[PDB]
Design a protein around this nucleic acid. Structure first.
Ligand SMILES: Cc1cn([C@H]2C[C@H](O)[C@@H](COP(=O)(O)NP(=O)(O)OP(=O)(O)O)O2)c(=O)[nH]c1=O
Ligand SMILES: [Mg+2]
Ligand SMILES: [Mg+2]
Length: 428
DNA sequence: ATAATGACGCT
DNA sequence: AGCGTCA
């Protein structure tokens, strides 16, 4: 009577080193080389926000300064984020994202989960492919980039060798009917994801990885296991061994404080150890929702549905003014607000044309010097007009009372961040 | 002095 | 509404 959470087929498709592929497609000289994407350039070469797998082999990572990365990888090639109105501008990658999401949209209902990934609910697609195939077995040729997590088992030294032995074992169990209806559905799901990824690559030039499983969390976890340019099937049966040495922080939403307290309070390291607690016990420690969610999740069960949403819910831009650069005059604050408001306007206008909708709320966020928190303060106002001067004016209006300076011009405390967000969209 | 962002829960 | 979490 226990629903094992094998009702759905869900996939997570995530692009490999995405911003790097976008720059490598446009500049062929960067292809198949250690490469990274940096923003800003004058401070220690710029901050790295995407790294190719060639560069990763030298230990180059995100957030590294480019000057440091070059110490690790002397031949590292760099591409810079477009700069516009004094700030980083991500338009090229937003546009490339749209290319990818629109292709995926052709196959099924997707939930845009980031600029470079979406969840796919393939349950319905699998059923109709299952009927269309009469009853013929699934061939290994239908899954040329697929890993079956946990296989091979029992009675080859190179990686593609292992992949095939695992797949051969899985497929041979499938046709002997030694697996389950859920396992077949996952397999069929994976054939479709092969097709989605081939379409993505053919039509964009971008490579990507995927996870196929019964829920979003497992699909996400599965994606990462065999990056790059591979997809991974994580079956319900693979979960006990998978989770038995799986650090807790690796599962989506447990990488922060909650996962830390799980570890700390329960005295555990791995996701599987959670199974020994009653749901009521988990709820007593982490609350009703988290308790329930953890109780089901450590058994590979999760119910969050793939939401039908291809478009971002908000449209925002921000700039940090770290340390000495912190804004400390009124006309500094006003001028940057206008820069933000101006980017926002052209993005909102593009949004209104493409997607037939209008934002109706403007949100202003600031960081003050000394504050740890991402936002020191949030205020909102009406967004009734896509006008940069009005939006910036209205944004100033609603924060100007933060100026503790008795002096007219000076701004105190100095602002370490400005952030404008358009929200509360409605059909237009 | 990672930066720029986006989704969402809580009260 | 305004703040806190996680990525
Ligand atoms: C996590 C993260 C990503 N990005 C950008 C750069 C990435 O290329 C793009 C997709 O994020 P990602 O999937 O987490 N990383 P990746 O696509 O570069 O590499 P891979 O997914 O590990 O293959 O989003 C940032 O600009 N700041 C970030 O903190
Ligand atoms: Mg990616
Ligand atoms: Mg991603």
């Amino acid at each position: 009577h226990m629903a094992t959470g094998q009702d759905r087929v869900v996939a997570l498709v995530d692009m490999d080193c995405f911003f790097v592929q976008v720059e490598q497609r446009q500049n062929p000289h960067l292809r198949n080389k250690p490469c990274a994407v940096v923003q800003y350039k004058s401070w220690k070469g710029g901050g790295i926000i995407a790294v190719s797998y060639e560069a990763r082999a030298f230990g180059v990572t995100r957030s590294m300064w480019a000057d440091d990365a070059k110490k690790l990888c002397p031949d590292l090639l760099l591409a810079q984020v477009r700069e516009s109105r004094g700030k980083a501008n991500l338009t090229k990658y937003r546009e490339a994202s749209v290319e990818v999401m629109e292709i995926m949209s052709r196959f099924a209902v997707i939930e845009r989960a980031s600029i470079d990934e979406a969840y796919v609910d393939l349950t319905s697609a699998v059923q109709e492919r299952l009927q269309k195939l009469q009853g013929q077995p699934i061939s290994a040729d239908l899954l040329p980039s697929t890993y079956i997590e946990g296989l091979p088992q029992g009675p080859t030294v190179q990686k593609e060798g292992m992949r095939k032995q695992g797949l051969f074992q899985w497929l041979d169990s499938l046709q002997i009917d030694n697996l389950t209806s859920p396992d077949l559905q996952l397999t069929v799901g994976a054939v479709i994801v092969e097709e989605m990824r081939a379409a993505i690559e053919r039509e964009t030039g971008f490579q990507c990885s995927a996870g196929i499983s019964h829920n979003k969390v497992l699909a996400k976890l599965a994606c990462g296991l065999n990056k790059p340019n591979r997809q991974t099937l994580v079956s319900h049966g693979s979960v006990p061994q998978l989770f038995s040495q799986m650090p807790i922080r690796k599962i989506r939403s447990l990488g922060g404080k909650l996962g830390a307290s799980v570890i700390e309070i329960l005295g555990i390291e791995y996701m599987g150890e959670l199974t020994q607690f009653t749901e009521s016990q988990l709820q007593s420690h982490f609350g009703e929702k988290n308790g329930s969610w953890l109780y089901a999740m450590c058994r590979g069960i999760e119910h969050d549905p793939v939401k039908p949403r291809q478009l971002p819910k908000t449209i925002g831009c921000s700039k940090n003014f770290p340390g000495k650069t912190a804004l400390a005059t009124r006309e500094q604050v006003q001028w940057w607000l206008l820069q933000l408001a101006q980017e926002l306007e052209e993005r909102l206008t593009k949004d209104r044309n493409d997607n037939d909708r209008v934002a109706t709320q403007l949100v202003v966020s600031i960081r003050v010097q000394g504050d740890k928190r991402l936002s020191s303060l949030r205020r909102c106002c009406a967004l009734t007009r896509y006008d940069a001067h009005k939006m910036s004016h209205d944004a100033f209006t609603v924060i100007k009372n933060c100026n503790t300076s008795g002096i007219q011009t000076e701004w105190s405390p100095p602002l370490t961040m400005l952030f404008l967000c358009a929200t509360k969209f409605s059909a237009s």
